[PDB]
Symmetry: D2
Subunit: 125 residues, 4 copies
């Protein structure tokens, strides 16, 4: 709860070397910035999202998600990613996610508008 808040807030790194900095609010909000090590991305981008401010205490992870639109002062990649996953606490804390990356397309190209992938975030690296 406040446990999750404290667990989630901070800097995370994924397997690609991207950096996710986030504050979890007591109200279930996630707010922060994201810097992608790959793709059409430079510097930091705003992120917002939500999390289960009251997960179970049977050892279950904590559900959460967030979005980045790939526009900032330096680039506009006409796209947006959402990550959906769960926070697991402890000595090797992790956010395990799957993500959808959608590009704005013509109607003709809409069938190929969305990439899918997975990112695992840790507190080190």
């Amino acid at each position: 709860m406040g446990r999750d808040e404290a667990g989630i807030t901070g800097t995370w790194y994924n397997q690609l070397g991207s950096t996710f900095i986030v504050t979890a609010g007591a109200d279930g909000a996630l707010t922060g910035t994201y810097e992608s090590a790959v793709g059409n991305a430079e510097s930091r981008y705003v992120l917002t999202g939500r999390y289960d401010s009251a997960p179970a205490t049977d050892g279950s992870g904590t559900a959460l998600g967030w979005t980045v639109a790939w526009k900032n002062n330096y680039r506009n990649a006409h796209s947006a990613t959402t990550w959906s996953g769960q926070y697991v606490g402890g000595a090797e804390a992790r956010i395990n996610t799957q993500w959808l990356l959608t590009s704005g397309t013509t109607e003709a190209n809409a069938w190929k508008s969305t990439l899918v992938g997975h990112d695992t975030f840790t507190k080190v690296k």
Copy 2:
């Protein structure tokens, strides 16, 4: 741009009868509430997300995404959904999305933590 802002802001309905009410901010923010016609959901839930405040003008859609954590004053479904998609404007304006719904799980059950689906939102119904 301001076009997208004006296009996106408002009430949308999906094929299931769910209701998405959203304000698009000039800064690329999405803020609002979501009421799901199905699943472990009651009343409205906070939503936040982002959108490409400056899509292309070659007739491409506008990328966007948002999250809902399935906790409010009435229920806690220990889960969170992200929708990723694009807004298409005009007489039959649409937000075409794919979504990931993750439940908090034990580590044993993490492989089955995430549902995937698609929702199409329109301004009527």
Copy 3:
């Protein structure tokens, strides 16, 4: 069972105008050809897959999936799609699917190797 076999076997069409011709075997096999109305595709491509030869009889759909590699005598698109979904029988019989389309990539590009989408197949159109 033999019901499913009879239900599934035949020609289906999706919302894009693609054509899926399939034989369901008594052993749970699916075999046939696919012709895509869109993308880097021409003529027919082999398809194979499986289905639950013994679904429930509580009105549940019948789970199934199949793959196409996008290589034939005319083109090689260095890619393969899998469709996962369920057959629903009756007067407006449907196969409702989600699909993953993966392209062979460099290791650098693997994070963007896979598109996701949804196709609905019917017996007419």
Copy 4:
């Protein structure tokens, strides 16, 4: 080509401890069996799929996919999984996949019919 055939054919293991045994045919076929270490699964299940019998030689992976219906002599889990991904050869050869697992459902429950995940297969473990 024959390279891919030789690369792919054999026994693979994923991070969960599941075992995938496959023969790649010269015609682009994949045929074999799958034994899942997790879920509603026992013993081996038939699998079929396809692969790009002629990938590029710029170091790109080889696209492929396959399906398992979760019915055999011991169990019927009313479901089917498709894996979509790419084979990468060499000293630490890998098949990197994403998967869709669909359960037969009522029409009411169709929105939650499909799980999504990722599996990485290697030749050892």
